[PDB]
Amino acid sequence: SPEAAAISFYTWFIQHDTYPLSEPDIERYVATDTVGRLRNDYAHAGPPNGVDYFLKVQDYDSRDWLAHIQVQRALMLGDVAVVPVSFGSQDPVHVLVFLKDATWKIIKIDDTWEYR
């Protein structure tokens, strides 16, 4: 079900390649304060590190990525679900999705890059 949210969301997201953050449908997948803060930061400065917040890249082959969405089983760290996601068939990109009523919502997405 968190795995499920992750997949429906990313499928929906790459499908839509209007920017999807500005669309209200994204609220079906992303926690509400999280959407607010993201739209705000996008308006002000653009997304963190200047890559797409959700895909963590400046460019990608959308066809292949939509074709190759791998999700590993969620980890539970208390209230929080950590879902590993890979995209693509060649040199896949990896992200960690964090999720939290009856539905699971995305509260954060992280890349695997070194902090520096």
Binding site: Y19, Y42, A43, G46, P47, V57, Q58, D59, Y60
Partner: protein, 113 residues
């Protein structure tokens, strides 16, 4: 070529959405050339050279493509295509080929093509 610059200018966002490279690439592909996709804007020189492009030097012409290296807080660099008046990536750059203060302050290396 010019049509590439035009495609870029028409298909912008209100602001950056972190996809300067996808936007500039899809522009060039509307212009005729489909470059070998690559994740980071800073890496796109070897892909442009592996196509029609050659490194320009001096004033920018409508269609010229800049490839910029990382600034602080911006590890993946930045791509743009001149429209004759403005540089264009995933948004319209009102200030210059540098898309923000991190770049303008740190002045990282760049290449025009």
């Amino acid at each position: 070529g010019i049509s590439a610059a035009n495609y870029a200018a028409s298909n912008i966002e209100p602001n950056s959405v972190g996809r300067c490279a996808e936007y500039v690439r899809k522009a060039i592909e509307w212009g005729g050339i489909s470059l070998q996709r690559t994740r980071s804007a800073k890496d796109y020189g070897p892909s442009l050279l592996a196509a029609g492009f050659h490194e320009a030097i001096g004033s920018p012409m409508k269609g010229d493509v800049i490839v910029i290296q990382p600034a602080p807080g911006h590890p993946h660099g930045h791509m743009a295509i001149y429209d004759g008046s403005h540089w264009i990536s995933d948004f319209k750059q009102l200030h210059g080929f540098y898309p923000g203060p991190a770049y303008r302050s740190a002045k990282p290396a760049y290449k025009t093509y």
